[PDB]
């Protein structure tokens, strides 16, 4: 058996004002309190890109050792949903902020393997529905919040490797001061594109996308219980269908949220209101000088030059 | 006797202490509400805000502060958002929508010292060039009650031409200002893309939309453009440029100014009458002391399809926000969420907007994208290239505006072939993002026709300059008493 | 270049449109005419040349992380058709 998985990590950037709006980010139980004129998607209103957002973006791009493009254009992800105020989600399809990087992930049992990251673009969040009371209520308190969608290359294999990769992303981003890192508050989220295939045949093994995974333990358990599930499904044959599943830690079972009848056409195209932002090598030249010392190399530097053990150096770093 | 209004003469008269802005606005409003139902050019007339703004215009005029135009009566399009006033764009969808925020253009103009009377009728989201698809009723032309004033700014042109108002605010999306101006013997100017901000201005085609003033004289729309231009930090498409001295740019001679007359502006679509009406203007411009040279545009004919691929596409995304969850009009019986979307967007507007959104979605759909949208954009690029290649020797490119005189109502309104075959010359400037100006050439069968002139980037002062030099040759001022 | 009622159906599903049986033929006809108009551009070669999304060749677009004041509750619901404790009421079930 060969388990080829993938990871789609959404990181919530810690900025005061929203990416295109002027409302605050951090907030408590008060609903609809962080929605100005921009977030309500009023007719005739226009969005303006945040400075520290793209700054932190290309900062992460520099930290991950990726070739940053000179120009990047925001594209539209047109889908209709009550949480989404406008008729399209401002993301990045072609020419993202960050592309093709690599992260040194720390594992156990000897070798410390390197994993690849295909891209890392700027996305946007939507509203939130809660179960009440009847009908439902949509809260745009989190709507308009800047997002960083780090999409990883399918080089990641075992589940433990995946947990290690999520921990490495979390640590690096925490060091960069981009996101809070607290998964409990709902800042750092991720999805997993897990797909297994029997060694020898490129055949069989449909992809399974498990969404909404919180803790590292949840990640590990869900990925395992999905891998073995797919293994059984291929062993029996049956019907290998593409669906977007979810995981609940209570029963440790995989549930299907939506049945994919056909490939969803989001209709991507360059956004006509927002012009492509040009990041010059001078920007990167200043940010590289502003770049903090990476934890993964700082603990190893705590091993090399200063007399210290692996354990205490790591927990110190 | 107060029908002969113009912002220059009105500022001069108010400076002469003849009366207050209140008397002017009350008399003019009196003229409005009496004859309006015959042409139906206005949808709503706010009296309280008008009289308040008039008194404030008086107290401001007392100390003569902050403006070239003080207490000038100007109306706005249903596209521009207004605090307190029902912005609707002239549609069933955006009906009963009182915007909680104003617009940069309305805010700037009012802060400059201009009284707003109310809102005039327009096409649904600037879609259509006939103003017959209006939910509030079709607008009638002051010269011919059986024909159309144009679109998608027919209401403004009809309002100003019919002596109701001295100056109004219009839109430019795909030749939606030049055509109504030409059909109503008016002077319409479109600024370079990025000059006038779009904040508050509801978009139909983001990369094509641009707000421009519409008035009787070039001087008037110069006085308006001088105010309504400039950068706005809230808008991303706005560009920073300091040239805003249009009023002083006048009275500059046409000594040895090169003028381009394209071959493609003379084809099989335009009638000979307007052709002679243009050649007379060219000869008169030669008498003014300007030189004329033949220029070429290889990709001018290919301007018509590409536009109707780019403009709908963007719209199909721009109008995607109109679902009725946050504002506008909501379904009476929403069985489902999908039912809410589909029914609300169904009972928005009829066939025109819906079908154009359909063609837009078809153009943006997976697969057809590269063959249609990308194609149209690259053709647009070729057009820009042709323009920047042409303007290397020619300063201003002149030609005919509308290829056909005004057509009657109840005819080919259901048929879009004639609708599309109208705007052929006027869309090139929109696709290229160049500043344009339509000034009336004369009259055909009692109906007014105009000539369009195009200029290079960020120098509208020159086009309004040749416009002013043109104002010296032949004036059509005494046209107000008839209608 | 050609279209059936189901093409118009799927386009309607994408852009979310309510269409009855009586409106179908006329819409198909007009749409086919429009496509018949746009199809002329395919004759022209477009190799090498780049697309034009925006008329002006503008650059960076930055906005500082400056927080702007927040409005009150009452200003939102004045136009909103559905309101409960400051939230928009919307049907949850999505099918067909």
From Swiss-Prot, chain A:
It catalyses: L-glutamyl-tRNA(Gln) + L-glutamine + ATP + H2O = L-glutaminyl-tRNA(Gln) + L-glutamate + ADP + phosphate + H(+); L-aspartyl-tRNA(Asn) + L-glutamine + ATP + H2O = L-asparaginyl-tRNA(Asn) + L-glutamate + ADP + phosphate + 2 H(+). GO terms for biological process: glutaminyl-tRNAGln biosynthesis via transamidation; translation. It is an enzyme of class 6 (ligase). Its EC number is 6.3.5.-. The keyword Ligase applies. Transmembrane segments: none annotated. One of its GO terms (molecular function) is glutaminyl-tRNA synthase (glutamine-hydrolyzing) activity. It comes from the Bacteria. Keywords: ATP-binding, Ligase, Nucleotide-binding, Protein biosynthesis. Belongs to the GatB/GatE family. GatB subfamily. Heterotrimer of A, B and C subunits. Allows the formation of correctly charged Asn-tRNA(Asn) or Gln-tRNA(Gln) through the transamidation of misacylated Asp-tRNA(Asn) or Glu-tRNA(Gln) in organisms which lack either or both of asparaginyl-tRNA or glutaminyl-tRNA synthetases. The reaction takes place in the presence of glutamine and ATP through an activated phospho-Asp-tRNA(Asn) or phospho-Glu-tRNA(Gln). This is Aspartyl/glutamyl-tRNA(Asn/Gln) amidotransferase subunit B. It comes from Pseudomonas aeruginosa (strain ATCC 15692 / DSM 22644 / CIP 104116 / JCM 14847 / LMG 12228 / 1C / PRS 101 / PAO1). The gene is gatB.
From Swiss-Prot, chain B:
The active site is at residues 77, 152, 176. Its EC number is 6.3.5.7. SUPFAM superfamilies: Amidase signature (AS) enzymes. One of its GO terms (cellular component) is glutamyl-tRNA(Gln) amidotransferase complex. Keywords: ATP-binding, Ligase, Nucleotide-binding, Protein biosynthesis. Pfam families: Amidase (PF01425). One of its GO terms (molecular function) is glutaminyl-tRNA synthase (glutamine-hydrolyzing) activity. GO terms for biological process: translation. Belongs to the amidase family. GatA subfamily. Heterotrimer of A, B and C subunits. NCBIfam families: gatA. Allows the formation of correctly charged Gln-tRNA(Gln) through the transamidation of misacylated Glu-tRNA(Gln) in organisms which lack glutaminyl-tRNA synthetase. The reaction takes place in the presence of glutamine and ATP through an activated gamma-phospho-Glu-tRNA(Gln). This is Glutamyl-tRNA(Gln) amidotransferase subunit A. It comes from Pseudomonas aeruginosa (strain ATCC 15692 / DSM 22644 / CIP 104116 / JCM 14847 / LMG 12228 / 1C / PRS 101 / PAO1). The lineage of its organism: Bacteria, Pseudomonadati, Pseudomonadota, Gammaproteobacteria, Pseudomonadales. The gene is gatA.
From Swiss-Prot, chain C:
Coiled coil: none annotated. Its EC number is 6.3.5.-. Keywords: ATP-binding, Ligase, Nucleotide-binding, Protein biosynthesis. It catalyses: L-glutamyl-tRNA(Gln) + L-glutamine + ATP + H2O = L-glutaminyl-tRNA(Gln) + L-glutamate + ADP + phosphate + H(+); L-aspartyl-tRNA(Asn) + L-glutamine + ATP + H2O = L-asparaginyl-tRNA(Asn) + L-glutamate + ADP + phosphate + 2 H(+). InterPro entries: Asp/Glu-ADT_sf_sub_c, GatC. It comes from the Bacteria. The keyword Nucleotide-binding applies. Pfam families: GatC. GO terms for molecular function: asparaginyl-tRNA synthase (glutamine-hydrolyzing) activity; ATP binding; glutaminyl-tRNA synthase (glutamine-hydrolyzing) activity. GO terms for biological process: glutaminyl-tRNAGln biosynthesis via transamidation; regulation of translational fidelity; translation. Belongs to the GatC family. Allows the formation of correctly charged Asn-tRNA(Asn) or Gln-tRNA(Gln) through the transamidation of misacylated Asp-tRNA(Asn) or Glu-tRNA(Gln) in organisms which lack either or both of asparaginyl-tRNA or glutaminyl-tRNA synthetases. The reaction takes place in the presence of glutamine and ATP through an activated phospho-Asp-tRNA(Asn) or phospho-Glu-tRNA(Gln). NCBIfam families: gatC (TIGR00135). Heterotrimer of A, B and C subunits. This is Glutamyl-tRNA(Gln) amidotransferase subunit C. It comes from Pseudomonas aeruginosa (strain ATCC 15692 / DSM 22644 / CIP 104116 / JCM 14847 / LMG 12228 / 1C / PRS 101 / PAO1).
